[PDB]
Amino acid sequence: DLEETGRVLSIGDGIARVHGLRNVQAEEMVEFSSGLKGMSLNLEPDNVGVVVFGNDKLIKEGDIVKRTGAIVDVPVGEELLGRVVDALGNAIDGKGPIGSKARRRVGLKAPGIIPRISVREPMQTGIKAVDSLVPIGRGQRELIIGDRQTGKTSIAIDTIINQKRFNDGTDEKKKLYCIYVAIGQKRSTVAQLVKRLTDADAMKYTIVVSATASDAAPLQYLAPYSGCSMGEYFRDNGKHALIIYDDLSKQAVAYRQMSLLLRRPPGREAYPGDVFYLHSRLLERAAKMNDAFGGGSLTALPVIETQAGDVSAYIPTNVISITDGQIFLETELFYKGIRPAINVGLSVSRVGSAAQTRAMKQVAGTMKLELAQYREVAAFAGSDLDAATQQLLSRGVRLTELLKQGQYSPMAIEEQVAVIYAGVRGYLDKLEPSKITKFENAFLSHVISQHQALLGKIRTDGKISEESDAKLKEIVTNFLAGFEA
Amino acid sequence: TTGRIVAVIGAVVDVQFDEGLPPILNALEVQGRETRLVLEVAQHLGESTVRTIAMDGTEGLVRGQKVLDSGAPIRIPVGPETLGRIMNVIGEPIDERGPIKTKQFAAIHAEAPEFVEMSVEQEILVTGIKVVDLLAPYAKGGKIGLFGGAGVGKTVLIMELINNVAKAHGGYSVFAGVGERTREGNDLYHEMIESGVINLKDATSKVALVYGQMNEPPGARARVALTGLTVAEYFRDQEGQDVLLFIDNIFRFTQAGSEVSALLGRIPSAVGYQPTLATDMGTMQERITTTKKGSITSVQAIYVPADDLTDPAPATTFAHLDATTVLSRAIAELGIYPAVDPLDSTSRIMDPNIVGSEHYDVARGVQKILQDYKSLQDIIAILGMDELSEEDKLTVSRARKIQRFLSQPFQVAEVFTGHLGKLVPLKETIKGFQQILAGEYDHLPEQAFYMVGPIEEAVAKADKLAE
Amino acid sequence: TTGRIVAVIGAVVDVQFDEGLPPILNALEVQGRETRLVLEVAQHLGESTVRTIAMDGTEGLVRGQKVLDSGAPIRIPVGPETLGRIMNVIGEPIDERGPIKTKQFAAIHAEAPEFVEMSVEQEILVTGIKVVDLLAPYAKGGKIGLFGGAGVGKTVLIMELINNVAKAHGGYSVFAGVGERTREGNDLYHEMIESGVINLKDATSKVALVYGQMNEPPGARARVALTGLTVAEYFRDQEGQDVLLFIDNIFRFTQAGSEVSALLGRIPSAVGYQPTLATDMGTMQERITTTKKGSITSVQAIYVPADDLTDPAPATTFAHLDATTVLSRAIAELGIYPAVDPLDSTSRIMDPNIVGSEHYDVARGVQKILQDYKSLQDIIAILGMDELSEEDKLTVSRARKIQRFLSQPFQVAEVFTGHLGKLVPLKETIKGFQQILAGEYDHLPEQAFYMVGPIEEAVAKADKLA
Ligand SMILES: Nc1ncnc2c1ncn2[C@@H]1O[C@H](COP(=O)(O)OP(=O)(O)O)[C@@H](O)[C@H]1O
Ligand SMILES: Nc1ncnc2c1ncn2[C@@H]1O[C@H](COP(=O)(O)OP(=O)(O)O)[C@@H](O)[C@H]1O
Ligand SMILES: Nc1ncnc2c1ncn2[C@@H]1O[C@H](COP(=O)(O)OP(=O)(O)O)[C@@H](O)[C@H]1O
Ligand SMILES: [Mg+2]
Ligand SMILES: [Mg+2]
């Protein structure tokens, strides 16, 4: 029976050349003698090239290969929340079986033109520099790009932690379910990542999909698509989900290995011709649906690691052209004290103020150009500058200091507006730059403990009221003079 | 004639025919599929076998599956019944509005119009955008290309060109979505419904849509640009009327070709591209032209990979264009929109005997002071503003005011700049820059010229900065 | 049962079997060889022919020579009676002290510990070294990596770290010489005999040695890392006792993998490397880890090809680490030792919640002024330090003093310097840099901070120059 079963001709480097399987489909899942799964990616006239989902010591010449008659699928639903799973959706946290009542295909194509609607809901990260200058909306694709140890993962983590405020509330369309996809990382890092989310009480709405460094290349290759289908469930059921691919750099590496050992010719940096289509078809699946389809969304945060800042490399240039915006991180700024290390000039968001609350739009609207005027004069300055150009330098330096932020303390949007207000209105222009960070800490905690009614009104009204503008001014000016002494 | 699949490797599918073998470029129908799957014959491998590229995903394909030869290349619906409708690569409606009711179809592969069919007629058309109108004007029935790296404003620019030029046009427009964002497809569709250019109940629709975004496989992206221009070829030839064609993005045509090139059995060329890069673009672009039968005004957004203009894809595209609009990241970073490089954009109709000696001299005058300012920028970077002569800082202040006056608010960019967009006439554009070059506004502040319409708005803004 | 050689090139040898084919990773024994020649099965080529990779020189092999399946993968001696002994790739003793009679054996290939086996414990390991403890401190049971190009001091650093930690660590230690200098192995062996951490007369030996140096063919160098790894694995699990694993140099694993990949008929990856680079490293590195069962504090020296940190070999290694120590050539050429780059060395425990708010702030202060100094470097070289402002001149003088106070005399470098080895406590390291940052030693000369122990010696050195 060579129509439904096959025989292994050769096996090496995760690739099995199989004779037979005459009725096997392209991209179909096949089972080996030892129980190991394999995906049929090459259909040649005399053989079938099968990529192996595990070790190949358990596969020998002459082994029997069997059809399952299906493409790859993964478990789906709210039963995955709080769980750590592998690429196929098998639980690896040891906390029991996933009691999921639904399955979903991993290779389902993106929604077309019709089922979509304009991005109109804010996806708050809690990071001042993001929510103000690179605002993300629900259903958007926003890249996190930069060298190693620039803070990429930490942007994604703080974004996840920030959602607790929405998920503990009663408002349901305000909620966001998180999916962290780890690709090619080590297991100890992943466990330390889960420990961090558990302490912040963030796990209860987070799915962790992990295909680590010891896992086979096909496992690493499939992991992003598996987690995407998990997000798509929320998207198609009137709910909002956030996915994080950390990172698509290591996924491309895994796919290259497969493609090279299937004897597909190499291109730029040894990558296959379809490496762009690999990520494009993935990130296109992130969308904001119209109300007839549920009004749910899927926001994607892909991560790309560059080498020595080389943004010109094959892989990074692909993902930049795909996404609706990028957040650029640099080591130079990181060690200069600018943490998060967001290069504001290079970073953009195509959705823009349409992804901001009416309050944040009022304060951040001016910041963009005001900082652009600053960077122009920054590499333009001790030959002594005139009063006008020294003012532009002063303002820019003081706004930059406000964009600084520590870790694991994601800020509410009303608290963000208040601290941006003080800088953008010039109330800190004649303050020594070294104490702006010190100012923000003491100023905010005073507004938190003694002025809840102000923050509460900015939160609920969604904008800066004329009465709120007067009250903010009243606090900042009197706090100023006390702090200055 | 019935054939059988023998090989499936990604987008590349090999099919065997025991009898009559189908010629290259034919459309083959795969049997036993839920959605219509088209394989376009690319090569004759020999031994009664053809090599094809798939127009959709190749998942679920079996060796030995029936494949039928349609007898002709991919054929799509043409005519006034494409107006207000969105089509894909193979001519299927994707707007959920039903079948395209017509007994008139055309093959997406065709011979490029001959040399005798070319028209030398060049006439300037007003666009409303100052930088373009002044420095690098577009011509009626000309070939316009908007260059730029990632995030510089290619889409925003082409969007407002449809918002302005289609108004000054009584004919039909075609928009080809080639390998870009499906999100922007939803954006453009609903914006045109709002603006009334697409009408879902009557026949007043004036824009035909063709889409094949970056979720589609390479084959689909490689031919969806030809599907777009074949609709444009009908309105031009079979009617004899003026047509407008917009493409975002035509780089994706070349990208898609390189994505399959390895699997077609080609040795890679320079910078990882296909050897066929130039001729593929040739037999495509040479169809995008004005003839003696009719006129096509074409606007093509062109991606510049890692904003490197030497890259073979964008570098080979320059020779196909009459007007080039080159966008710059450094100019976008300053906050100047559109981010058009004034010293890297050409027009060809830039000639004293075409646009006028008054127009031409202002354009060169604006370019001269900005080029001279660039050399002055090299001094104030190290020594500072205090070192410049009184003559020097006079030209700097004028050059900086001219930089900002080149920028204007777009009517499709309300969320980005804050205030509404506005259209500026050509005669007011020449006069405006002419006045600044003479030094008539050396008393006005610098930010008075930033993001305004005509020169009259700059005067009014100067009063508003005081109190 | 019996096989026949059909193809030989370099370390890659093809064997054909009539009946019963050996599974991938099986050790094969070549007949007719005076010394033991182990072929490890890597690929099933089809037609009853396997593709293998040798563990020693393949010279003197003939087409038709007989090969026998061992039945298992390469198995080496493991257990307490390996301590004080030196062994090669296939676990054969190379110290001329006789057979290693162990009660247990273990295959050099094993699957990496599952996700449930992972421990989240992060506790500081004080090295006594200023650059390390201050900026990027190592963790107990964590993974440590020492990056560097040719001659910047990877080996000198790992040897000082052995001397500083292994004495104060009441447990067993494992050293794996991978593709490095053989005379270094001789120096380490006899030094350990001299000190007493390795004993030939007694079973008090605390260190096990495994060696496959740059004189071995690629097959040996590609696998020798697993042999030393398997010894370390046993001590972690089937005892509970804490283990130190030192590897010099782990790059040789990946380099040797590149040599054989060219002969296995693979299509090369970028930079000519193997397409399986990241997954080969992945299945190997994930075995070097702390579990809930036992703890492994691993230190790995990592070579950097042509000083390029973007090279696929060092670049892929970063994600397998918990603390990085990157060495720079320019910092080495200035006379700074250890040549640690303060702005490219990282640690996951560099966090106010873990090391303290005072420790963290000083570390970030040291880094800020060094990045500020690095920015001015161009204008300093064109014009001069005298053309700087009063604000900039003050940061430059302090940063230059911080640079030098980061350097330290090592106990292993007691001949290379002629000076005394210095071991500095953490509290005194924090205090030292804190004072320079606040401006307490602005009057003191630069060279006073060069190559000293604690902050007190910087003052005492300045007194002699008065
Ligand atoms: N806003 C911040 N403030 C202080 N430290 C930060 C901040 N963001 C990141 N870090 C630190 O930087 C280090 C690297 O962060 P990580 O997100 O792991 O970088 P990447 O993901 O780019 O490798 C971490 O040790 C983290 O503690
Ligand atoms: N005319 C404009 N006015 C203001 N901002 C603009 C304008 N054009 C582009 N931008 C900015 O650049 C971003 C990218 O625009 P887009 O057209 O998507 O660039 P590209 O198509 O070249 O990738 C926008 O989201 C916007 O922030
Ligand atoms: N901490 C140090 N103190 C003094 N000299 C050093 C130090 N580190 C390296 N060196 C010098 O550099 C040389 C090479 O060191 P080594 O560790 O062998 O480099 P690598 O192992 O990176 O090739 C040594 O011979 C020594 O003279
Ligand atoms: Mg990370
Ligand atoms: Mg675009």
Ligand SMILES: [Mg+2]
């Ligand atoms: Mg060494």
